[PDB]
């Protein structure tokens, strides 16, 4: 593997996608990088709202497993055949790897109009793979077949393309220190949030509220999704801290835009260090969570029915190291996360964890 060749290998607020060549001869697809799922799933049939798809009949090396997979959720669905084929990633590798592949033949609201990508690369753990955890994940195939370490890292530069470095850490994608937080459970990239701070003022909440259901790092979620109680506290704190006349109720919930930066507060998320007595904060400036769409803006944070999702809103500010080998998630500030000659994110530490509980994940 060549880590320098993986710099700028993603194309981008509708997702970051990697060019992947599938089958014999190779068919070029554009595949969404998703750290919150574990299946390699692509478009199989000729569907509306997409340019191209993976035709299994054109691949001589394709082999069907003889079974289907179905994923159920509230706002849609997708069904596909499970098979096996050779895959290469041009920007990073120069040899093919045998992987599992789901080919989507029917789906509800999956492929949206005006989206460039036509599949998803699930980079989370075997636990989440469908129909079961025995279906070898793409990254597990890659680690084993490509002789790379069990580590990848991701940088998103949309707010400033991006980079998915498969096998390690590229030193040119960051400056300063990498801070590591432990992976509490290996399914999603679940990490422990200790505190949320708005304009230097902590939310007066139990730290279990941040990890109610789970707190995860997900490149396949657009916004910073917060549980309803945490979301209402953040909105109240941002509204109070903001100098201006109040934002509308519709702005907070995402129904309407705000049209027209020192007037808006910083938002910091404290994460436990590998030493449990210490923590570090990942901080986003207003430029990351008041997102351009008279210039009109949308609120980059949304309410969640279940989990606290550290989505693209936050990941845009940081080079994120998914160190599966050492059971930890690294964070460093992205040099590309810069607008109008000003850094739109910060990282700092250490901070004490003496006031907070030893385990903020409920059990």
């Amino acid at each position: 593997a060549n880590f320098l060749a993986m710099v700028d290998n993603l194309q981008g607020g509708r997702g970051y996608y990697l060019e992947m060549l599938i089958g014999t001869p190779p068919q070029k697809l554009q595949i969404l990088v998703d750290t919150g799922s574990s299946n390699f799933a692509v478009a199989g049939t000729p569907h509306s709202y997409i340019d191209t798809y993976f035709d299994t009949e054109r691949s001589s090396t394709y082999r069907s497993k003889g079974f289907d997979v179905t994923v159920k959720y509230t706002q849609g669905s997708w069904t596909g055949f499970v098979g096996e084929d050779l895959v290469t990633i041009p920007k990073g590798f120069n040899t093919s790897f045998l992987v599992n592949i789901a080919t989507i033949f029917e789906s509800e609201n999956f492929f949206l109009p005006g989206i460039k990508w036509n599949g998803i690369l699930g980079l989370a753990y075997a636990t989440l793979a469908k129909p079961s955890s025995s279906l070898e994940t793409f990254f597990d195939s890659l680690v084993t077949q490509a002789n790379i370490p069990n580590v990848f890292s991701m940088q998103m530069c949309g707010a400033g393309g991006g980079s998915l470095v498969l096998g390690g850490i590229e030193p040119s994608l960051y400056k300063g220190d990498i801070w590591y937080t432990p992976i509490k459970e290996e399914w999603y990239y679940q990490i422990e949030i200790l505190k949320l701070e708005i304009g230097g003022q902590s939310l007066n909440l139990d730290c279990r509220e941040y990890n109610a259901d789970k707190a995860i790092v997900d490149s396949g979620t657009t916004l910073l999704r917060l549980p309803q109680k945490v979301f209402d506290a953040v909105v109240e704190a941002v509204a109070r801290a903001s100098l201006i006349p109040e934002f509308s109720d519709g702005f907070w919930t995402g129904s309407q835009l705000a049209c027209w930066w020192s007037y808006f507060p910083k938002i910091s998320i404290y994460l436990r260090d590998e030493n449990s007595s210490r923590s570090f904060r990942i901080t986003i400036l207003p430029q990351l969570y008041i997102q351009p769409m008279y210039e009109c803006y949308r609120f980059g944070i949304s309410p969640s029915t279940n989990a606290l999702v550290i989505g693209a809103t936050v990941m845009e500010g940081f080079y994120v190291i998914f160190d599966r080998a050492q059971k930890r998630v690294g964070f460093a500030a992205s040099p590309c996360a810069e607008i109008a000659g000003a850094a739109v994110s910060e990282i700092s530490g250490p901070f004490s964890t003496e006031d907070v509980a030893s385990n903020c994940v409920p059990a």
Partner: nanobody
Amino acid sequence: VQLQESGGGLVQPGGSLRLSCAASGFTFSSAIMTWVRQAPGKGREWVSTIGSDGSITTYADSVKGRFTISRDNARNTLYLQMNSLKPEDTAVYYCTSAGRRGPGTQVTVSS
């Protein structure tokens, strides 16, 4: 996903072994199977991968022409036929599938 390797041993240069790996606790007939090797003080090295039906096989350039991967889905067994062995082939050979691995079998080649 339970895996247990066997068939390794001490051989001469130009020798031969036939590794096996018994599988249980999962649908072996639907699983991609891969042999990996690891020697002390050396990097982890992929040997060969075989698809679930056995028709698609891939090999590392270091073993191409000399080693052959195969499987018996009816018997839940993966194989590696090893020919023309040399001292550089000395390692623990283990089978892996879906992020799990077996403890492996020692292959030693020496004069």
